[PDB]
Amino acid sequence: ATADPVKDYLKQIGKVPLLNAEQEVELAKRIEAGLFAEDKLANSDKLAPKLKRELEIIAEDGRRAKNHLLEANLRLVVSLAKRYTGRGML
DNA sequence: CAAGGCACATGACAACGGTGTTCAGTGCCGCGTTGCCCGATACCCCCTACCCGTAGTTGACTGGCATCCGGGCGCCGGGTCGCC
């Protein structure tokens, strides 16, 4: 909590793990795994409770991987925003 | 010389003259205002042209910006860390 909140935002980015090819391809594999898990859960057909909880856990892990990609690439957006700054928008 | 007999005019007499009222009736005609007939018009339709919003675009491309000093001047007031 300081002045010039952009500096605070960069500090909020902090140190996060940059992803090498294997890392993000595996992460996206887990993303589509969670996608299929939630697709199965959304179906009105009855699924066993333990299987439904497992699918929910897989979907949650997928969400975490999404967040990891977001935070890792936060640095990428800040550079792109600088690429367009100084045109009447903050 | 006085009395009796004839002319012209005379006290009224109505009835025309001419015109003024009045009745009483019926209109005459003053303006106000109705019933027409047209021209334009606002209000439905169809058509397409162009504005306005939405959705994509695959080598790679991973942290920015320039601040700010010569007020000046003092005070309040709180915070802030030493102090013994």
Where do runs of H (alpha helix) occur along A14-73?
Answer: 21-42, 49-72
The single-letter DSSP state of residue A32 is: H
CA-to-C1' span, A46 to B52 (A): 46
**Cβ–Cβ < 8 Å for A24, A69:** yes
Is A6 within 8 Å of A74 (Cβ atoms)? no
Angstrom distance, A4 CA to B70 C1': 27
**Which residue, A39, A79, A84, is CA-closest to A59?**
A39
Q: Which two tokens stand for residue A79?
A: 């550079």
Nearest to A65 by CA among A24, A36, A8, A4: A24
- List protein-proximal bases of chain B (any atom < 7 A from a CB): 62-66
- CA dist A83 and A22 (Å) reads 29
Closest C-alpha among A24, A34, A31, A26 to residue A72: A24
